[PDB]
Amino acid sequence: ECLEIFKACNPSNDQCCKSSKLVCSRKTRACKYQI
Numbered sequence: 001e002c003l004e005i006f007k008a009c010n011p012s013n014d015q016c017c018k019s020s021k022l023v024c025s026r027k028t029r030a031c032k033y034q035i
Contacts, residue, residue, distance in 0.1 A: 006032035 002017030009015045009024030009031035016022045016031040024031035 003031035006030040
């Protein structure tokens with residue numbers, strides 16, 4: 001599941017989308033689109 005709202009992203013369990021900008025590494029464990 002893609003976490004663009006900034007939901008806690010998993011280290012192995014690929015959550016964030018692909019083409020989506022929602023990043024989880026750059027920011028906290030949470031995955032959210034890059035401002």
